[PDB]
Amino acid sequence: EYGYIVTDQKPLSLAAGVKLLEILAEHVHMSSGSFINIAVVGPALTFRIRHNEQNLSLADVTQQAGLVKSELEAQTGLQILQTGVGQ
Amino acid sequence: EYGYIVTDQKPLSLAAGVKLLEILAEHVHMSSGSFINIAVVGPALTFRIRHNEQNLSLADVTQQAGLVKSELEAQTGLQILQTGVGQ
Ligand SMILES: [Ca+2]
């Protein structure tokens, strides 16, 4: 499984994808360095999460990305079209 | 916002789509009639959720869909490739 965020960017830059992860990390109180297997592919950011004490899951992180969607958009200048988990 | 389930069937049939919703409903102990605004679009099923006695959310229902993906697949023959929330 991997997490993803689909944006309106064609294509999404690597820098912007990492900024999304920085904001998300701050909200889930973890190091942005706990996001692994990162790539941007077309308009999408994909990632996994490293083992952690907190037991934070991909589910948890994508739910969180919905909770703070407005903040993610405001701080990055992009639009988030989908957030989910792929197989 | 809407919830979605992306399959490996293009076009996804409406009947197959709502069969996914029935299995999902059984799993989360909600009536499938609480899934509203339903459409199939390409390989995807999209929906929203009405007031329900269980007070359940889109992130929660789509996370659960991810959890029971092998059941959804065993019962329908579809593969579930993504689950998430869109705008
Ligand atoms: Ca928006």
Curated annotation (Swiss-Prot), chains A, B:
It is found in: Cytoplasmic vesicle, Secretory vesicle membrane. It comes from the Eukaryota. Glycans are attached at residues 37, 55. Residues 1-87 are annotated as: Sufficient for dimerization of proICA512. ICA512-TMF regulates dynamics and exocytosis of insulin secretory granules (SGs); binding of ICA512-TMF to SNTB2/beta-2-syntrophin is proposed to restrain SGs mobility and exocytosis by tethering them to the actin cytoskeleton depending on UTRN; the function is inhibited by cytoplasmic ICA512-CFF dimerizing with ICA512-TMF and displacing SNTB2. This is ICA512-transmembrane fragment. It comes from Homo sapiens (Human). The gene is PTPRN. The chain holds residues 470 to 556 of 979 of the full protein.
